[PDB]
Amino acid sequence: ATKAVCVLKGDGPVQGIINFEQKESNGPVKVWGSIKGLTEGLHGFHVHEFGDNTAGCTSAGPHFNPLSRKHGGPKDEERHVGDLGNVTADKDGVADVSTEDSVISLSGDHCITGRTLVVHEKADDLGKGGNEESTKTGNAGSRLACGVIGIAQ
Amino acid sequence: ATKAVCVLKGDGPVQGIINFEQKESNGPVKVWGSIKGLTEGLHGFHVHEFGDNTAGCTSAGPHFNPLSRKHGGPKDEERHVGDLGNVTADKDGVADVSIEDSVISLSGDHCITGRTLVVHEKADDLGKGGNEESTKTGNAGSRLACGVIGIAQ
Numbered sequence A: 001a002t003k004a005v006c007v008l009k010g011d012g013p014v015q016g017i018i019n020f021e022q023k024e025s026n027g028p029v030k031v032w033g034s035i036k037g038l039t040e041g042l043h044g045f046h047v048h049e050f051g052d053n054t055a056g057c058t059s060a061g062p063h064f065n066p067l068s069r070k071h072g073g074p075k076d077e078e079r080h081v082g083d084l085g086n087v088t089a090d091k092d093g094v095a096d097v098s099t100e101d102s103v104i105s106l107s108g109d110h111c112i113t114g115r116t117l118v119v120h121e122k123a124d125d126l127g128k129g130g131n132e133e134s135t136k137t138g139n140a141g142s143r144l145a146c147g148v149i150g151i152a153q
Numbered sequence B: 001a002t003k004a005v006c007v008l009k010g011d012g013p014v015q016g017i018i019n020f021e022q023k024e025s026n027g028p029v030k031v032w033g034s035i036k037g038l039t040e041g042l043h044g045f046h047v048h049e050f051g052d053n054t055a056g057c058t059s060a061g062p063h064f065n066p067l068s069r070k071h072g073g074p075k076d077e078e079r080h081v082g083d084l085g086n087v088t089a090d091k092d093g094v095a096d097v098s099i100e101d102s103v104i105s106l107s108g109d110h111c112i113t114g115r116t117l118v119v120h121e122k123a124d125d126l127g128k129g130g131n132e133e134s135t136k137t138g139n140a141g142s143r144l145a146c147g148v149i150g151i152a153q
């Protein structure tokens, strides 16, 4: 199996640890972990193109989109490769993450390793918001925490 | 060309931005940038195996060594792929990094993207120290700052 990991940090209180595992190169990636310090509700959760944190999370660029598609949710055919939807936090400030995704990979051209995982301010509308921004960013707003996805033991 | 970047962070602050560029996949990688907050003298500078900073720089594991060789300096045939020698800081605490290396890569089996760059406490003896640890770590000591190497624009 192939494994990867991301430590999410930012300028505020949001922080987390996300793990990735892919049993087979043509198989799904399991994604799990925790993010704390969040406001209650949905927070957009994406892989962005660049593993560049030079100036903070802004440096990561747009959603990872090697197929030049519109933004969507993880269960949509029309999505960016990096579109992992939302994480949802309770009034404890914690989002428990446990998902499986069939479009991201830890090898090949859809590889997310070396790119940035970002948790956002606001909900991602999964491209169903009915405006132009919805099909580019999902209207998820600013970047609260991020990290470069790295190769794990 | 292919480009990568690493934001190094540690207590001091020891911090720096290191850029990587490789004109072709069969060619050398140019490495440049600046690290501040260092004590005067040599500091070991290596790519470590894992891009895991879960518990800090310790989580990055040993030097990146896909070929199962002993530790050396960057000019040695017998070296780890991750062996980039030392950076040298002056009294101002700044090391200017300018390296070209023919063994690291930003693609293929020796790709360093997704792995951790680390700057160390002490000098790397380049495997010439005459003891057991010299040919494993270069006796460079603890890890002052690190970051995951990411894909750049």
Ligand SMILES: CN1CCN(c2ncnc3ccccc23)CC1
Binding pocket: A025, A026, A027, A028, A102, A103, A104, A105, A106, A107, A108, A109, A110, A111
């Ligand atoms: C279920 N999965 C679909 C995505 N998948 C891929 N991984 C890496 N690169 C790819 C390039 C083109 C198409 C699919 C790719 C891995 C397994």
Ligand SMILES: CN1CCN(c2ncnc3ccccc23)CC1
Binding pocket: A001, A021, A030, A031, A032, A033, A097, A098
């Ligand atoms: C192959 N594997 C990858 C997934 N995996 C996990 N390990 C630990 N905690 C988890 C929490 C939620 C979901 C999966 C988890 C271990 C088995």
Ligand SMILES: CN1CCN(c2ncnc3ccccc23)CC1
Binding pocket: B021, B030, B031, B032, B033, B098
């Ligand atoms: C062809 N290239 C243009 C970009 N490039 C550099 N750019 C900016 N500063 C540098 C400082 C020291 C060494 C190389 C540097 C090197 C690769």
Ligand SMILES: [Cu+2]
Binding pocket: A044, A045, A046, A047, A048, A063, A118, A119, A120
């Ligand atoms: Cu995002």
Ligand SMILES: [Cu+2]
Binding pocket: B044, B045, B046, B047, B048, B063, B118, B119, B120
């Ligand atoms: Cu090292």
Ligand SMILES: [Zn+2]
Binding pocket: A046, A063, A070, A071, A072, A079, A080, A082, A083, A136, A137, A138
């Ligand atoms: Zn998207």
Ligand SMILES: [Zn+2]
Binding pocket: B046, B063, B070, B071, B072, B079, B080, B082, B083, B136, B137, B138
């Ligand atoms: Zn070494």
